[PDB]
Symmetry: D2
Subunit: 251 residues, 4 copies
């Protein structure tokens, strides 16, 4: 099943879409500068691109780390990003009451992994009618994603993306099960599956590349980066993706 995001086609047999940006929104000027770099590199390669940032990040590593400019200023920044570049945007929501006003502006709304079974948030997100990115918890097996999908369907929204971020592997360590992509496709109606390589990890750039290439080899809708260098990386991913997506799914 493909999902249209403005003029982008997102789907497991379409050219991959890059989801990338910055961790937390701080100012209009800085956001535009980073966004402009993603836009320039992706336009030069012909890769569809969706800008990501948090306006209120609720899971930072310290309680006084800056959580972002907050809802009202964050949405004003996202509006400017959209007007200036003509691209879609994505952000995470963690409070049910924020879903509607965020959805007025942000094309894709993201369900944080830890909150993925929180029924009130699921329902509030679903009711926006927007495209939703469902982050797979590291403690949930790929055959359980279908339960989350079901809850969205019950709440009236089938525009769902499933986003892999690794699985717990002993203590303090994540492994990405490359077989889980196919499990999610088969059990969840071939919804678009994208791969958050950045959170899947924890030199490092060489790791991100191997891991990204390995995941994209399985035929995926997109690559998600919590992130010369970007360009070189994307050249390699696009080479692999172009090859994979050009061959028909096996008989």
């Amino acid at each position: 099943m493909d999902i249209k995001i403005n003029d982008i086609t997102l789907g497991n047999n379409s050219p991959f879409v890059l989801f990338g940006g910055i961790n937390v929104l701080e100012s209009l000027d800085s956001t535009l500068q980073t966004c402009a770099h993603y836009v320039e590199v992706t336009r030069k390669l012909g890769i569809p691109y969706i800008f990501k940032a948090s306006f209120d990040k609720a899971n930072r590593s310290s309680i006084h780390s800056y959580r972002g400019v907050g809802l009202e200023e964050g949405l004003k920044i996202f509006e400017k990003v959209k007007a200036e570049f003509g691209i879609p945007v994505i952000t995470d929501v963690h409070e049910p009451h924020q879903c509607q006003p965020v959805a007025e502006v942000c094309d894709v709304i993201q369900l944080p992994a830890r909150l993925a079974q929180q029924t009130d948030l699921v329902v509030a997100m679903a009711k926006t009618g927007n495209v939703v990115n469902i982050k797979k918890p590291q403690f949930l097996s790929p055959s359980q994603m279908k339960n989350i999908v079901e809850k969205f369907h019950e709440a009236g929204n089938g525009k769902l993306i499933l986003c892999e971020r690794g699985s717990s592997f002993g203590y303090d360590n994540l492994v990405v099960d490359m077989l889980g992509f196919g499990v999610m496709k088969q059990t969840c109606g071939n919804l678009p599956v994208i791969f958050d390589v950045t959170h899947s990890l924890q030199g490092r750039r060489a790791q991100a590349l191997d891991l990204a290439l390995a995941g994209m080899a399985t035929r995926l809708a997109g690559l998600f980066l919590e992130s010369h260098l970007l360009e070189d990386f994307l050249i390699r991913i696009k080479a692999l993706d172009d090859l994979i997506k050009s061959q028909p799914i096996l008989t």
Copy 2:
């Protein structure tokens, strides 16, 4: 470090405390009945007791599943429990705005395992000043609990209980690492460590719960956390006679 919960002393070298009750509050009458049974059994066995229930099941499989009585009615039921039995109570909170009104009634407030890294909730819970039970996420290692403790400390609340509930082991399965209890004691300032045997089984019986509970309590713990309806309620007394026997033995031996 011990924690006083009204007249109860909770600590890793004190007699174990039972945190026991039910999954979710369904009605006043059923709650009082179950609670009365826990109280009667624990008083006669001389086991200190805190009543547990959720007022909301927030992460059920269906949008149409029963969720429990909800905050307003739930707090009314907790108020009646406290007035009728004179015992402390514990319940979980899922949203920052719930913390202060819940804490006005419930002695211990609990941080759900999945939400344990949500900073907004941590801060809102810390600011209540109440005793907090931190459910250890299945996906976090015992050495990383200190990071959560640090956040609460930075927010000004040091009255924290660490609650084991098992670790992810491959897909859809949990294992309890009996070494993790000591790791938590050593790295988190010997705060009280309790064991939720009920949720540790998770994805596996009365025989199993008893073996697992005894194993964990053998490592010298401040308490045991459990649900009945989950253990059959009528087996509670026999179960607790066993856990107390072991706990009395273990706590009577000097540490080292």
Copy 3:
């Protein structure tokens, strides 16, 4: 099901048996000194005791580190242990040809975890008619132990002990699943289950850990505890204090009927 090992009764509802000794036989005099210490402490506490050592260490830290004294001299040292102290002994075998000569001297023969699905070794061990200790591989689940048991039964030997030694938990780390003991008892006919606490740690002071882990396991009602000490692995001089604690817990548990 109980197993008689000379005058010892090994079983899940019997007083726990200590299987203790050393990693590898390296000498005579030092073996006897270590054994004597175990003997003295266990006799003083009334704990049944079986001396353990390998004569040939299969997985060595380096290719030239000493493998141990080998079969022939190893068996001679086991003979001396048995003659001097009157106790049973346990050792591991690695090749089918070793099974007969080791079984003639040793009261229990041990199937190494890494070799536990090697059919030729299983058959050769089973055919000795000796008591066998089966080490549970870290990569095998507890419900699969029944398949090894089956193969022994097909080959004519039901005198089997199951030994826990942890499960792989992510990379280079072991967890002991305390529920696996009961799984092994339920699926394998209530054969004796013992716990190798020494190899369960492995990848993790260590003394405080060994005690916590041993106490936790023994709380589930087990036939025995399997450990290694070093003569200066638990410090040998702390053995009495360690055993006092294990005995206290075991005596309590075993004194209550199963629920």
Copy 4:
């Protein structure tokens, strides 16, 4: 570091080599038939090929289950394969005393994963001087492979292949950590790394996804088992491998 196996160049920046065959040798005729098929598919696609089989099934479900032809007859069959097709062959050895006679016939000798820390078997394999395929235990981290490599080096043999076969993931399950390939290359001197997709695991769809993902990390070779499913798989793997190997290392 590349390894020459007759006229095949095996290495992490060379075109991938297929190691394929059957589980256990049952008879000459079946073996030649299966081998002929692999040879015919690989030749037509231009993929270097090494025939694999075990002469013994060391873990049988029953004490009475079929065992395979055994060492003596097995080696005779490997000799015929080599004479008829002119290709290298690979087999596993489980006991030290087997190493020298097997190594007389088989080009590559394989160290089984559960036996990879058995020091007597390591030394006896090293001493053959043959190319050795070291199966990574499911219970070992990729950073520990350097310790096994060290032992082989100390015993005088540096012709070593490292082979991924998955890691224990809870009970009765395996996962393949795609980051382990790079860890093994960086810590073990860029020895050839290959991927046993068969033992890492409809199910044919799984093998293809997994094989593609692993080969995307740039590897020396693959293990695979067999309406023309083998050829359809290999067409895809070769396309990907050619692409990956054509990009400069970053």
